[PDB]
Write a protein that binds this ligand. Structure first.
Ligand code: HEC
Ligand code: HEC
Ligand code: HEC
Ligand code: HEC
Ligand code: HEC
Ligand code: HEC
Ligand code: SF4
Ligand code: SF4
Ligand code: SF4
Ligand code: F3S
Lengths: 242, 961, 182, 156, 158
């Protein structure tokens, strides 16, 4: 969730900044502002804001809650063996932790809750960020398979970076005994799942051009293979499929 | 925090005008030896936009491209701030004492002028009041691009000087013969346009239509909106017209046109024209020797059409032979005979081929005096350079082309101290103090008013009405009996044709520091900011050059054409229309300009070079290469002997279109009168409605019960009364390209630089995209189509849905209005729209805008800041002042109380714009017409501007194929 | 209260780079946006079509005896209203009872009562010209007021003249309350 | 938001009754136009040019009930009466104005002059130094008929 | 105003017919302050300005931005008063701009107009208490006059 939350930070900067008028973006928020104005909720560029301004939060609060026993462990160590006596006072993020029965059961059902309550959000966050494309009238976007697809792209992208971090978090500063290589083995399946689910959509794209496309959508994908970006798509699909 | 920006009202209130509201003064507009009419807005005595003169029947309220940029020539920076002597900006008050003492006690004094061509009586009469004193005034009218050549061919044909008018509504079939009658370069662009368009305007399942037959040597805009066009090198069009008339019956004429006995497009049209006597026309362009225009007189008289080629006797002005005077001028320069040299509005150092020297004489003679608007190459070389007024401060008089006798209203005081308009300067030479042009001009009229009412009821009436009504020359009859038939053997060949031709957006370079015009796509090719050479792929593939693009920017090779040891190079671009061994190098675009303002550097952290288009200098510098001096002044449009050298420095060349030739797509859907006679429901047949479902417009969505038009909050205002829409009679739409420029001035914009538009952004809202359609590339017959494309302000409107920051809405009356405030710049307003018309204020072009052009942006609309979209808005600004004026006093909006810029400027009455749901207006007649062409209707968008298709009209067989 | 120009954060588009009428223009000698027109210029729609209706210098005689327009009382409604805003200030609502300025002990030239018979028989085109061009001691007002108001004002006057020559005289005036202000 | 919705519900009724009384008048004129200009004009599009409005006017009557009943059903939302009333008067004055624009052409052919009692006929905005529109709205209101336009042509 | 009894159309002319009605020229003061006072060390700018060309350096207030246009005549002719919007000026030595003239308040009238609009009989009357039964006396005009205020983006923002 580190590898998520910081990605979301360097992500959210773009919607704040590929706009030309950054300073006038608080209008996008639904504050009762200095006039009787409010945003337009038919706009996936707005869904993105609430989504990411919820997804930065839920993923954080689910990570922060995820790491309570750490702060308990580190708060417990800061007194007897650690940096300073004043790391304990920094570790008040423990929030009066003792590992008790009364609230550890609650921690489980909450971790269950956010699992079954952040996944329905994850499938809406990236889907929103796909809805912005496919809601349009463009032929290369209006194809409806995209929200599952880009999600699989998020799988096939995200794990494709986690492994880059784990390899370099395994050579020098590594955990041979805890980051078992068998983990990365069973990790790349759910990558390779989307190594083919991503591939099936390219077929559908490349298919519907031949099946019942608009005479533009017929051309829209001939462009992708044959045209300026032949350097991209021939190699890209082949890269993501080979 | 904000400033306290004050307000400085009148002191000595002029009674008529009022602060907030403009009022329309009625000026003229000189160029090219004639004077189009015009009508300004004049916001509080400051001109902001020009318009047409609806009373003047020659124009009937229209303005081509070439005027609206002149409005910005008025407000240029780097015009003529100081008076320059020797090149030094020294002073004025000494010049009057100087030039006055030169003038009164002068005697013979042997002066010369080299004027802009007069077309005005105050100029031509003051010439006599001038020539009365000083003995010999050589008085050469240096026509831009030499003699007009329509007129010199006819002084012998009719035995005396004459000009034609060319109605074209009383006349159907038109062999052009290179004639750009529909060309903004040429004169009388309206009366050529309109009554030609009316012939093209059907409003019926079938009507009798022009069916021209153009035979151009260089692909030009008239050849586009056309039928059966042909490519054939100039310098041989005489040989074309030679075998032409022999197949009609005037004379033998066989030897000149040796090889066109039985050509299809010749023998085809010949039977038709003799079969259309009171309807056929024979024009003639400008790329010829004058015997062609004799043939334009011989056959057109012999054809029987005289009321269709309305002909009008000039005021005895046949003497415009460029050889006869301009050489004969410098033949006196080299002898020390002529002393003074009084240029008015011209750059002959820029122009004026070296084959007949000018600069070699200019440096010989002192007492040089250049009256001038810019400071280009003539001020820099002269000893005195007056500054010049534009025509907006002249009190000038002027003739419309061949007809009425108009007069300027001067609107603004001289913006610059001591401008000293040419007319009173020409009278300052007349041995008195600077004549008040207001009182000078008036003194001519009493000798020539031709109106029984005195001045303060007539002067006030003409200065009001814009045109002296009864004038317009008397109409001559047939003079020719086959006189002019003896300059044929100038059909010379044996070399690459190097023909010149003036783009619609510039005229002999005299309007180059003009962004609205300079960043104006040519209609042939959406080219901007560079002169070019256009030619065939067969010569290119036989020469070795290309218009290759691996970045969508058209990298270009070069030519390095060489004439008589006076070679220069330039970008070569290619077009599938032009013929073998010929290139149309456009002029202007090579006009060095000398700046008074700084280059305005800012830190490297800040962008100025990409934005400050007026920064690095003034505009006309280095935009291309100068080309005028190369030609030979004999038949001074054409040229031979270009020893081409494909050399390096292969640099960019930028366009808006960037491409062409739709792949058989539904975006123009041309159709024949044969096919149109068969299926009037063919604008829909390309993408018809569905199996058993409704017609396409007014097609229901998923929602119909909660649709906002059925809800009040969209329906409840003072607006729903009059839904607005804007059709386009595309049958008369050809790349005049003035549909743009009035949008640019009415609803303000900035310009864009080459360095910027190369990446593909242009802040022209109304794309005027052209397209090619060949028979699956059969013979590479282009058969172009032009069609404007504003933001068809949709109903379903994907863009409206998608601005999260509600900066878009289907405003009442089909209007889909943008707000340049609420937006933020996420640009997905644009990405939805099939028509990428939601432009975007990428950089802050207006912040770097100088203290000069700022007069021009009209004081009624929201100029826009970085990070903001923008689009057509149907010129909403003049909906508001009208609908507001109807909210004050209870009324509807008339059929013509409001006219948009695309409407009021397009001289072909293509756009009509009258409110939908008002059945008496023109739009409901033009929408209820059979071909309500609904562009990309198939996306269930339901838009307004349900415009029309073209109906190209081919010929029955007649040995056409 | 906040005596300085208040904080507006986004000054991007308040003071547009272009300038509307009656706005500062930092170029010209007289810092001003209007740049008044040159004499002799004429609009397209404001010619002296019918000189009677725009001027009184209308025939060989330079003045006119009667109003040219057919005068409904709705014209005179504006006459009454337009009088009591820019003409009753000095001549007064009653014409003779001098308005607040002249009854204000001030250094101003006293004007003649309209009820004087010398004014009760005058070319109405002259009294029009009194507005469009002014008089020896009095300014003009047709420099600014509409021209139909220059007529409506007169019908009210000529009617107000017809108040006298009848015993509908001595209208009550509210001037004293205006001298006090409270 | 002064006192709720029930206040405006009287005037919205006062608009719909004007429409109902105009069902008579418009359909009455639609008889009279067929009587007046039997054959004195093209009349083939130009009569249906007057009918095309009529199917819309009648359609709005059933709506003006639906518009209104959605208001009187719940009087607890002020932001529907001002809008339904702003819609009615516009959907009303439009159809009044559209009847007129089709009806002035009737006189335009029967009379060679579309009369000087046609509209306010004020002028452009720069024709305010001479003629404020205030004068004009007291000409237009007190001279021009809304739907006594063709009954006026019974006098001709 | 408060003790000279001038209504507002005198020197703020072109508020009945124009948009963005004008501050007066200098000429208006020269109607009377050419020969009424001729003494003060307070308006020597004025006398010199008529005797010169530098107009009077007037600051302004109420300057809503120039991307949101406005028209008094569109309001005034339809019955809106200056008490509502520009404040009670009759006792105001210098302008307080007691109203904000921002959108959120600009729009309360275009949603709730009949609380404000005047009968147009003597609209420029700072000492105006409206009658009782004001509202119902007003809505009968919106039913008749058919004003239909704007709620949209098209009106002022363009
Ligand atoms: C009579 C009822 C009125 C008088 C007299 C004036 N107003 Fe208005 N007003 C309003 C605004 C928002 C402005 C600013 C204009 C702009 O920034 O474009 C104005 C302007 C004026 C001015 C001149 C100041 C200027 O040039 O900006 C004057 C003398 C003036 N107003 C007088 C707002 C309103 C408003 C609310 C709708 C009303 C009813 C009026 N103004 C009406 C009057
Ligand atoms: C407002 C519309 C009006 C009208 C209808 C008139 N005035 Fe005046 N006026 C003023 C003064 C001091 C004079 C006398 C000039 C002198 O002594 O030389 C006048 C003159 C007149 C006349 C007489 C013209 C004639 O026929 O001889 C008339 C008919 C007339 N006025 C009408 C003073 C003022 C004001 C003081 C500031 C103002 C305001 C007006 N006048 C305005 C009007
Ligand atoms: C001339 C004799 C005036 C009279 C009578 C009234 N006004 Fe005034 N007004 C006048 C001036 C010269 C100014 C400029 C302000 C300054 O800096 O002195 C004003 C100001 C206003 C304003 C504010 C405009 C601004 O500066 O932004 C308003 C709203 C205004 N005036 C309205 C107004 C009304 C309603 C009047 C009668 C009731 C009135 N003014 C009298 C000139 C004169
Ligand atoms: C005739 C109708 C007047 C016009 C038009 C204007 N003003 Fe005036 N002003 C007038 C009077 C009779 C008085 C004096 C009343 C008093 O209480 O003494 C004034 C006063 C002023 C002042 C005050 C002078 C001082 O105390 O130093 C000023 C600054 C002033 N007036 C300014 C002014 C301006 C700027 C005007 C045009 C915009 C203007 N006045 C019109 C009478 C009349
Ligand atoms: C009452 C208190 C109002 C305030 C405050 C504002 N407006 Fe207004 N406006 C009002 C009415 C009653 C009307 C309708 C008159 C009619 O007969 O239609 C209007 C109308 C407008 C319009 C009309 C559209 C046009 O003619 O261009 C515009 C543009 C408008 N109003 C603008 C506007 C602005 C910008 C305001 C505050 C900043 C504003 N109005 C306030 C009544 C009232
Ligand atoms: C008058 C007729 C208006 C209408 C209707 C709407 N707006 Fe408005 N808006 C108006 C003004 C005079 C102002 C200025 C307020 C100020 O801050 O000084 C505004 C403000 C805005 C803004 C904020 C601009 C800023 O600089 O802070 C926005 C983004 C805006 N208005 C948008 C907007 C939209 C989307 C509307 C309908 C679609 C709308 N406004 C109505 C005037 C008027
Ligand atoms: S519609 Fe546009 S391109 Fe066509 S002729 Fe008119 S201005 Fe030119
Ligand atoms: S075509 Fe584009 S700009 Fe025009 S209404 Fe539709 S989406 Fe908006
Ligand atoms: S309406 Fe105006 S902005 Fe729109 S295309 Fe036409 S001229 Fe240009
Ligand atoms: S999507 Fe919307 S917020 Fe603006 S940049 Fe485009 S109109």
């Amino acid at each position: 969730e580190a590898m998520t939350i910081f990605a979301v930070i360097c992500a959210l900067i773009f919607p704040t900044f590929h706009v030309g008028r950054v300073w006038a973006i608080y209008w996008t928020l639904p504050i009762p502002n200095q006039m009787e104005m409010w945003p337009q909720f038919k706009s996936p560029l707005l869904w993105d804001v609430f989504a990411v301004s919820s997804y930065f939060i839920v993923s954080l609060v689910f990570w922060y809650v995820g790491l309570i026993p750490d702060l308990a462990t580190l708060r417990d160590r800061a007194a007897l063996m650690g940096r300073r006596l004043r790391a304990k006072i920094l570790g008040f993020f423990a929030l009066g932790w003792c590992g008790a029965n009364r609230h550890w059961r609650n921690y489980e059902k909450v971790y269950m809750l956010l699992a079954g309550l952040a996944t329905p959000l994850v499938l809406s966050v990236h889907s929103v960020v796909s809805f912005d494309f496919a809601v349009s009238i463009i032929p290369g976007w209006h194809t409806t398979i995209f929200p599952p697809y880009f999600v699989a792209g998020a799988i096939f992208s995200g794990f494709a970076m986690v492994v880059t971090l784990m390899v370099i978090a395994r050579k020098a500063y590594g955990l041979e005994n805890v980051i078992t290589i068998d983990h990365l083995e069973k990790m790349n399946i759910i990558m390779l799942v989307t190594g083919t689910m991503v591939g099936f959509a390219y077929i559908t794209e490349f298919f519907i051009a031949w099946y019942s496309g608009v005479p533009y959508e017929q051309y829209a994908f001939i462009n992708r293979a044959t045209g300026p970006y032949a350097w991209a798509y021939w190699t890209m699909m082949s890269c993501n499929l080979i | 925090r904000r400033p306290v920006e004050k307000i400085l009202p009148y002191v000595r209130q002029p009674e008529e005008i009022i602060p907030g509201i403009p009022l329309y003064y009625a000026t003229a507009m000189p160029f090219r030896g004639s004077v189009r009419p015009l009508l300004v807005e004049s916001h509080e005595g400051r001109p902001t936009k020009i318009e047409g003169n609806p009373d003047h029947p020659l124009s009937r309220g229209a303005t081509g491209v070439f005027e609206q940029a002149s409005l910005l020539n008025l407000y240029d920076p780097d015009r003529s701030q100081q008076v320059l002597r020797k090149g030094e900006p020294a002073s004025w008050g000494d010049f009057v004492q100087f030039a006055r003492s030169l003038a009164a006690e002068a005697g013979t004094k042997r002066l010369a002028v080299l004027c802009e061509p007069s077309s005005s009586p105050t100029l031509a009469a003051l010439r006599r009041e001038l020539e009365r004193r000083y003995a010999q005034v050589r008085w050469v009218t240096y026509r831009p691009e030499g003699d007009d050549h329509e007129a010199l061919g006819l002084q012998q044909a009719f035995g005396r000087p004459v000009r034609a008018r060319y109605r074209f509504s009383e006349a159907r079939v038109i062999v052009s013969l290179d004639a750009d009658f529909l060309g903004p370069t040429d004169r009388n662009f309206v009366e050529n346009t309109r009554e030609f368009a009316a012939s093209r305007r059907m409003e019926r399942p079938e009507d009798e239509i022009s069916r021209l037959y153009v035979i151009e040597s260089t692909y030009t805009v008239t050849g586009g909106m056309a039928d059966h066009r042909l490519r054939l090198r100039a310098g041989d069009i005489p040989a074309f017209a030679a075998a032409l008339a022999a197949e009609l019956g005037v004379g033998e004429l066989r030897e000149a046109g040796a090889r066109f006995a039985g050509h299809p497009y010749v023998v085809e049209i010949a039977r038709d024209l003799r079969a259309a006597g009171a309807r056929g026309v024979v024009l003639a362009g400008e790329t010829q020797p004058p015997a062609v225009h004799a043939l334009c007189a011989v056959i057109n008289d012999l054809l029987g059409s005289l009321g269709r080629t309305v002909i009008l006797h000039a005021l005895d002005e046949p003497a415009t032979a460029q050889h006869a005077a301009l050489a004969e001028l410098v033949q006196a320069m080299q002898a020390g005979a002529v002393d003074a040299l009084l240029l008015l509005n011209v750059n002959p150092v820029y122009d004026a081929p070296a084959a007949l020297g000018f600069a070699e004489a200019l440096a010989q003679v002192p007492e040089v005096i250049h009256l001038g608007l810019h400071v280009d190459e003539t001020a820099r070389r002269s000893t005195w350079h007056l500054p010049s007024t534009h025509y907006l401060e002249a009190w000038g008089d002027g003739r419309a082309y061949d007809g009425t006798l108009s007069v300027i209203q001067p609107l603004i005081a001289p913006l610059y101290e001591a401008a000293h308009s040419p007319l009173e300067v020409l009278a300052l030479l007349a041995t008195g103090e600077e004549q008040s042009a207001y009182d000078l001009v008036r003194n001519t009229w009493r000798r020539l008013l031709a109106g029984r009412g005195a001045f303060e009821q007539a002067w006030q009436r003409v200065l009001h009405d814009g045109f002296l009504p009864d004038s317009g020359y008397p109409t001559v009859s047939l003079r020719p009996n086959r006189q002019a038939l003896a300059d044929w053997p100038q059909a010379a060949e044996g070399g690459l044709e190097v023909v010149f031709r003036l783009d619609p957006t510039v005229l002999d370079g005299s309007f180059a520091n003009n962004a609205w015009a300079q960043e104006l796509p040519d209609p042939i090719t959406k080219i901007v900011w560079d002169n070019v050479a256009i030619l065939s792929p067969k010569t290119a593939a036989a020469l070795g050059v290309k218009a290759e693009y691996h970045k969508g920017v058209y990298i270009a090779d070069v030519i390095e054409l060489s004439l008589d040891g006076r070679a220069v190079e330039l970008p070569v671009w290619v077009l599938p229309g032009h013929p073998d061994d010929s290139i149309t190098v456009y002029l202007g675009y090579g006009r060095e300009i000398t700046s008074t303002r700084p280059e305005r550097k800012t830190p490297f952290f800040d962008l100025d070079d990409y934005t400050d288009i007026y920064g690095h200098g003034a505009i006309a510098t280095g935009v291309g290469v100068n080309v005028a001096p190369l030609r030979r002044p004999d038949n001074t449009w054409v040229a031979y002997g270009a020893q081409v050298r494909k050399t390096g420095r292969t640099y960019k060349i930028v366009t808006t279109q960037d491409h062409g030739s739709m792949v058989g797509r539904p975006l123009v859907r041309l159709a024949t009168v044969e096919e149109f006679r068969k299926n009037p429901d063919f604008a829909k047949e390309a993408e018809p409605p569905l199996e058993g479902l409704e017609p396409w417009d007014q097609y229901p969505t998923l929602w119909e019960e909660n649709h906002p038009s059925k809800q009040p909050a969209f329906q409840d205002s003072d607006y729903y009364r009059n839904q607005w829409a804007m059709v386009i009679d595309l049958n008369a739409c050809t790349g005049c390209n003035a549909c743009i420029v009035a949008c640019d001035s009415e609803n303000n914009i900035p310009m864009v630089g080459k360095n910027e538009v190369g990446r593909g952004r242009e802040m022209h809202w109304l794309r005027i995209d052209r397209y090619f359609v060949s028979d699956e590339a059969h013979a590479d017959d282009p058969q172009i189509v032009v069609q404007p494309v504003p933001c068809m302000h949709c109903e379903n409107a994907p863009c409206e849905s998608v601005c999260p920051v509600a900066a878009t809405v289907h405003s009442p009356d089909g209007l889909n209005e943008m707000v340049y405030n609420r937006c933020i710049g996420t640009r997905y307003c644009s990405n939805n729209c099939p028509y990428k018309v939601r432009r975007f204020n990428w950089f802050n072009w207006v912040k770097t805008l100088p203290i000069q052009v700022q007069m021009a942006q009209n004081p009624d609309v929201t100029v826009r800041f970085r990070g903001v979209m923008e689009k057509c808005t149907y010129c909403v600004q003049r909906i508001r002042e009208a609908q507001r004026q109807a909210n004050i006093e209870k009324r509807p909006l008339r059929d013509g109380e409001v006219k948009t810029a695309c409407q009021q400027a397009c001289p072909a009455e293509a756009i009509t714009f009258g409110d939908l749901n008002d059945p008496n207006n023109a739009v409901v007649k033009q929408r209820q017409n059979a071909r309500r062409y609904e562009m990309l209707a198939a996306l269930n968008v339901k838009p307004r501007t349900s415009y029309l298709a073209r109906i190209t009209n081919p010929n029955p067989r007649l040995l056409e194929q | 209260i906040s005596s300085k120009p208040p904080v507006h954060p986004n000054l991007n588009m308040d003071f547009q780079e272009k300038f509307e009428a009656q706005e500062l223009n930092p170029f010209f000698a007289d810092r001003r946006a209007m740049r008044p027109p040159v004499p002799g210029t004429v609009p397209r729609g404001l010619l002296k079509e019918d000189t009677p209706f725009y001027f009184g210098k209308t025939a060989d005689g330079a003045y006119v005896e009667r109003i040219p327009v057919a005068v409904t009382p709705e014209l005179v409604a504006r006459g009454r209203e337009r009088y009591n805003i820019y003409c009753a200030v000095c001549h007064g609502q009653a014409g003779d009872g001098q308005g607040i300025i002249m009854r204000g002990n001030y250094g101003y030239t006293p004007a003649p009562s309209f009820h004087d018979d010398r004014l009760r028989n005058v070319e109405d085109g002259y009294i029009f010209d009194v507005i469009s061009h002014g008089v020896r001691n009095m300014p003009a007002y047709g420099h600014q007021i509409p021209v139909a108001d220059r007529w409506a004002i007169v019908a009210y006057v000529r009617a107000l003249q017809r108040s006298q020559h009848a015993t509908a005289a001595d209208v009550p005036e509210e001037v004293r309350a205006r001298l006090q202000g409270e | 938001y002064p006192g709720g919705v029930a206040l405006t519900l009287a005037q919205i009724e006062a608009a719909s009754e004007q429409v109902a009384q105009d069902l008579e008048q418009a359909l009455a004129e639609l008889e009279a136009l067929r009587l007046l200009a039997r054959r004195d004009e093209t009349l083939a599009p130009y009569v249906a040019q007057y009918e095309a409005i009529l199917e819309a006017h009648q359609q709005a009557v059933l709506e003006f009930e639906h518009w209104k009943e959605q208001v009187a059903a719940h009087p607890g939302d002020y932001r529907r009466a001002n809008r339904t009333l702003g819609a009615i008067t516009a959907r009303h004055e439009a159809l009044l104005q559209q009847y007129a624009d089709v009806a002035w052409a009737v006189a335009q052919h029967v009379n060679p002059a579309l009369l000087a009692r046609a509209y306010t006929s004020s002028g452009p905005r720069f024709f305010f130094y001479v003629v404020p529109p205030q004068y004009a709205r007291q000409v237009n209101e007190q001279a021009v008929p809304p739907l006594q336009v063709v009954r006026y042509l019974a006098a001709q | 105003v408060g003790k000279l009894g001038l209504d507002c159309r005198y020197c703020h002319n072109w508020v009945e017919v124009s948009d963005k009605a004008n501050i007066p020229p200098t000429q208006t003061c020269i109607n009377c302050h050419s020969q009424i006072l001729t003494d003060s060390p307070r308006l020597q700018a004025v006398r010199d300005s008529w005797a010169t060309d530098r107009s009077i350096e007037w600051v302004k207030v109420h300057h809503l931005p120039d991307y949101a246009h406005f028209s008094h005549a569109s309001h005034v002719n339809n019955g809106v008063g200056c008490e509502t919007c520009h404040g009670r000026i009759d006792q105001m030595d210098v302008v307080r701009l007691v109203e904000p003239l921002s959108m959120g308040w600009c729009l309360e009238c275009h949603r709730q107009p009949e609380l404000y609009l005047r009968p147009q009989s003597e609209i420029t009357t700072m000492g105006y208490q409206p009658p009782a039964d004001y509202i119902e006396r007003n809505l009968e005009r919106i039913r008749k006059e058919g004003i239909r205020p704007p709620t949209n983006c098209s009106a002022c923002h363009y």
